[PDB]
Design a protein around this nucleic acid. Structure first.
Length: 131
RNA sequence: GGGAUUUCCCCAAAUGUGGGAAACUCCC
C-alpha cells in the first residue's frame, strides 16, 4: 500500500510545512497524461513550478512517456526531473489531483525502479585514463 | 582538495534521477 516502496512524501519529515525535505529526489512521477502528451508538453507543463532538468547529451529535458506493454501506446504515465529539488516537492503537492489536458492527473516523488529489481543502472565503455 | 563550464564513448524498452574518461577557465 501507500505511495511507493519508499512511501512517497509520507516519511519525508517537515514536508508538511516546507517545500524542501528532499535533495536526492528532484524527480517526480506522473499519471493520467494520456496519449495527447509528449516531452515538450510535460516539460512545458511542469516548468511553471521550477526549471526542468536537462540531459547531459540529448539536450532535451529529462522526461519519458511510459507505455502499455500490452498494446505499445501511451499508458498515461511519465517521469519529469526537476533541475531543483524544492520544485519537485511543490510540483507533487500542486499537480496531484488537477488536470493536464482536460483529464485528471496524479504526481508523486520518483525513485529509480531499476534499483528495486533490475539491479539499478550500470557503466559502459568509452575513453579511458591516459587517453 | 571541492564546486561550475566544455568535450568524447555505449544498449533500450522499462516502465521513476545512466555511467566512465580528458582538457581549459573561473570561484572557494
Amino acid at each position: 500500500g501507500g505511495f511507493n516502496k519508499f512511501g512517497g512524501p509520507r516519511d519525508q519529515g517537515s514536508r508538511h510545512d516546507s517545500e524542501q525535505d528532499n535533495s536526492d529526489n528532484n524527480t517526480i512521477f506522473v499519471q493520467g497524461l494520456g496519449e495527447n502528451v509528449t516531452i515538450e508538453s510535460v516539460a512545458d507543463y511542469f516548468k511553471q513550478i521550477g526549471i526542468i532538468k536537462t540531459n547531459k547529451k540529448t539536450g532535451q529535458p529529462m522526461i519519458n512517456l511510459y507505455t502499455d506493454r500490452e498494446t505499445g501506446k501511451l499508458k498515461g504515465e511519465a517521469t519529469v526531473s526537476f533541475d531543483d529539488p524544492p520544485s519537485a516537492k511543490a510540483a507533487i503537492d500542486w499537480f496531484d489531483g488537477k488536470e493536464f489536458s482536460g483529464n485528471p492527473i496524479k504526481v508523486s516523488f520518483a525513485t529509480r525502479r531499476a534499483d528495486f529489481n533490475r539491479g539499478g543502472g550500470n557503466g559502459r565503455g568509452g575513453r579511458g585514463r591516459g587517453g
